[PDB]
Amino acid sequence: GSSGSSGMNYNSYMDEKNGPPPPNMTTNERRVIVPADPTLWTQEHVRQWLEWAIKEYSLMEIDTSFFQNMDGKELCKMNKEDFLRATTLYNTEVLLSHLSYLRESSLLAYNTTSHTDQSSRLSVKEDP
């Protein structure tokens, strides 16, 4: 007769080989600026934040004793008036705005999520 087999596979793959150190570039090392929302803050997040803003924004003459051990939730209840008693208006606008900016992000965080979640189980490694 007269018959054959005309048909190629045509495919590709990767080996994923990594060379010796040093590595490409660092990523993270126990560094966090915010947990999530201003309502779920800790006693430290209330301090580190202030010490940070005063540095970045480079403010001057601001109450610190007020944020020595204030509840993260209280920071939200604080209004232009409450904040005015702690610092000037110019500063109150720099704080309230920041605390309000974080919330503006949550507006997008609210997702339906159709069975697309993932558990967290990442632990640091060491030794050969």
Side-chain angles (χ1 to χ4, degrees):
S2 47
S3 246
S5 274
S6 266
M8 195 159 81
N9 295 29
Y10 204 105
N11 44 263
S12 186
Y13 225 74
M14 50 246 143
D15 184 275
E16 194 115 45
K17 69 193 106 91
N18 74 267
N24 190 14
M25 224 107 137
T26 186
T27 34
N28 320 283
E29 50 121 80
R30 199 134 164 287
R31 291 213 115 170
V32 66
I33 188 153
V34 148
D37 251 38
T39 34
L40 307 158
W41 262 28
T42 70
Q43 54 116 314
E44 205 214 315
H45 285 116
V46 180
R47 253 245 287 174
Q48 262 212 115
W49 173 63
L50 209 82
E51 257 213 303
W52 181 89
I54 302 164
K55 245 204 73 152
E56 192 49 81
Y57 289 93
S58 312
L59 313 164
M60 56 186 168
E61 314 186 284
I62 189 172
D63 278 44
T64 23
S65 76
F66 225 77
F67 313 101
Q68 70 91 4
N69 189 53
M70 192 123 90
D71 321 271
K73 265 201 101 116
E74 247 239 58
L75 253 57
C76 271
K77 280 133 199 208
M78 293 261 298
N79 289 311
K80 190 93 115 289
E81 300 213 52
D82 314 334
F83 266 121
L84 262 165
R85 299 160 185 286
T87 189
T88 60
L89 209 303
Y90 176 87
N91 279 327
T92 300
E93 296 214 65
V94 179
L95 299 162
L96 193 66
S97 187
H98 200 331
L99 251 57
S100 83
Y101 178 86
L102 304 165
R103 264 178 111 195
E104 230 122 86
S105 304
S106 328
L107 279 301
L108 81 99
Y110 275 124
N111 183 44
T112 63
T113 310
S114 188
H115 295 192
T116 55
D117 192 56
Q118 262 257 227
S119 324
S120 73
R121 278 218 188 286
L122 268 97
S123 178
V124 61
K125 66 122 63 63
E126 74 226 74
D127 258 61

